[PDB]
From a paper:
Acanthamoeba sterol 14α-demethylase ([name]) is an essential enzyme of the sterol biosynthetic pathway. Here, we report catalytic properties, inhibition, and structural characterization of [name] from [name]. The enzyme displays a 100-fold substrate preference for obtusifoliol over lanosterol, supporting the plant-like cycloartenol-based pathway in the pathogen. Cys434 serves as the fifth (proximal) axial ligand to the heme iron.
VT1161 was selected for cocrystallization because, in this work, it was found to be the most potent inhibitor of Acanthamoeba sp. Additionally, it has been previously shown that VT1161 does not bind to human [name],59 indicating the desired selectivity. The asymmetric unit consisted of six very similar protein molecules, with the average RMSD between their Cα atoms being 0.22 Å. Each protein molecule contained one molecule of the inhibitor bound in essentially the same conformation, except for some rotations of the very distal portion of its long arm (trifluoroethoxy group). Within the active site, the N4 nitrogen of the VT1161 tetrazole ring forms a 2.2 Å-long coordination bond with the heme iron. Overall, the binding of VT1161 did not cause any substantial rearrangements in the protein backbone. We surmise that, instead, multiple interactions between VT1161 and the protein moiety impede the conformational rearrangements that are required for catalysis (e.g., acquiring the substrate, redox partner recognition).
Residue numbers in the entry: 74 to 486
Write the structure that this text describes.
């Protein structure tokens, strides 16, 4: 079991898989001239919309990615964290003195609530949430297996998808027009950043399609990644064995933070929760939400004496790569504290839950803050137990989440 590169031919296409840190090197270390995202990620274009992300040419795409990075910078996150905390506290306040919850359903709800606020702004959060959630659900239901091959197939799900997108644009057109009418009012959200964004060489702001598309993209990200890793984080920690070993260190750490900082959850406090961080990271190691990341090969390369020609699609599976024993001792065991030592390793591309290199996750820090917020609030206010077996990965959506039901029992402290 030290195969680390192999090829299928399927549908007349050569798929080449790269497993483990050495094989990863040609995937992550190269750039846009050598590897292309366009063709593998076609499926996303009619979801986010035309001329947005993988539907834009490189020139525009590279600038859109800089806008996104700005919207999720450290500075921006400082101002979002209060919002993220409030939403979480309001949400879990609604909970009874004890009961049972599907954690996956719950965190999907909370994360899309929070995202609507930070991404899309107060107006939408407070006036139009239900409309936005419904429109998103429709978008998401137009992502079928067939859609990765034929995105613009005129089947019903695709029609409703396209209609839902256009509706979403119309909704934001109103908010944007109102904001341009009153442009001296500052707003704390990604929308503001996208409204102030300008392409270079041009007095051109993004139109409403592009702005809406960038926000669909980021909403999609949170629902497809953060919400699942957020669920696993708890499912894994509050399994009886894992709970025994690891929860003490976590609860201790929360109390040490409260003594230095107080009851208030802040950027600085969350940034100190190392043991909780590693719990999230280990859930991510074991059940990464993205099955594959992919590129079309433009410039051929060899790894060992294995030749990968132009026109190949190369794949990395974070799931596979991070179950390799040579890299991760007891690969199939839950051990958060592996990352004390693992984090000190010099060799690149061992952990690839957030990808790496030029196109690594720009939302990593946001994800950690969102997920640590959730579990900080939960840990501080409840005693929690896993109901039954640890769920198995469910591969039906275009996302690998824990299979329903994902039940936790809670009792208030
Ligand atoms: C724990 C949750 C998350 C995981 C596991 C995750 C994972 C990843 C991975 C593996 C990539 C690389 C994709 C590729 O190479 O093609 C990526 C890219 C990206 N992620 Fe995330 N992500 C997460 C959360 C987020 C969040 C919350 C956002 C923002 C809303 C976000 C925004 C992005 C963006 C914009 C990229 C594009 C990188 C590029 O093409 O340059 N992610 N993410
Ligand atoms: O990488 C994403 C997802 N993401 C990244 N971070 N959080 N979510 C992405 C990238 C940039 C964004 F702005 C928003 C995004 F959501 C993405 F571009 F849409 C994306 C890329 C690849 C996949 C993907 C994952 C697994 C797949 O399985 C392969 C198979 F379907 F079997 F053929 C197929 C596709 C999903 N989303």
């Amino acid at each position: 079991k030290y195969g680390d590169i192999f090829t299928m031919k399927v549908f007349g296409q050569r798929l080449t898989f790269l497993v483990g840190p050495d094989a990863h090197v040609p995937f992550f270390s190269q750039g846009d001239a050598e590897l292309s995202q366009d063709e593998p990620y076609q499926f996303s274009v009619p979801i986010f919309g035309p001329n947005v992300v993988y539907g834009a040419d490189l020139a525009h795409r590279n600038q859109q990615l800089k806008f996104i990075a700005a919207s999720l910078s450290t500075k921006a996150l400082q101002s979002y964290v209060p919002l993220i905390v409030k939403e979480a506290e309001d949400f879990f306040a609604k909970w009874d003195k004890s009961g049972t919850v599907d954690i996956r359903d719950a965190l999907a709800e909370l994360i899309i609530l929070t995202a609507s606020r930070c991404l899309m702004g107060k107006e939408i959060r407070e006036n139009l949430f239900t409309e936005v959630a419904k429109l998103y659900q429709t978008l998401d239901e137009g992502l079928l297996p067939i859609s990765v091959f034929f995105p613009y197939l005129p089947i019903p799900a695709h029609k409703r998808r396209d209609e839902a997108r256009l509706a979403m644009v119309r909704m934001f057109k109103k908010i944007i027009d109102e904001r341009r009418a009153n442009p001296e009012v500052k707003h704390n959200d990604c929308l503001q950043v996208f409204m102030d964004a300008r392409y270079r060489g041009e007095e051109q702001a993004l139109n409403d399609e592009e702005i809406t598309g960038l926000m669909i993209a980021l909403l999609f990200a949170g629902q497809h990644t953060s919400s699942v890793t957020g669920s696993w984080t708890g499912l894994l920690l509050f399994e009886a064995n894992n709970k025994k070993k690891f929860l003490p260190g976590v609860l201790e750490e929360q109390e040490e933070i409260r003594k230095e900082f107080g009851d208030e959850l802040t950027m600085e406090a969350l940034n100190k929760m190392d043991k909780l961080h590693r719990c999230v990271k280990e859930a991510l190691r074991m059940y990464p939400p993205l099955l594959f990341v992919m590129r079309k090969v433009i410039k051929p390369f060899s790894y060992k004496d294995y030749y990968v020609p132009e026109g190949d699609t190369v794949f990395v599976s974070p799931a596979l790569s991070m179950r390799v024993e040579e890299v991760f001792p007891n690969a199939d065991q839950y051990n958060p504290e592996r990352f004390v030592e693992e984090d000190k390793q010099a060799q690149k591309y061992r952990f690839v839950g957030f990808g790496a290199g030029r196109h690594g996750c720009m939302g990593e820090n946001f994800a950690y803050l969102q997920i640590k917020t959730i579990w900080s609030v939960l840990l501080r206010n409840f005693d929690i137990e896993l109901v039954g077996e640890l769920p198995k990965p469910d591969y039906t959506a275009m996302v690998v989440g824990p299979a329903h039901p994902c039940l936790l029992r809670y009792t208030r402290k």
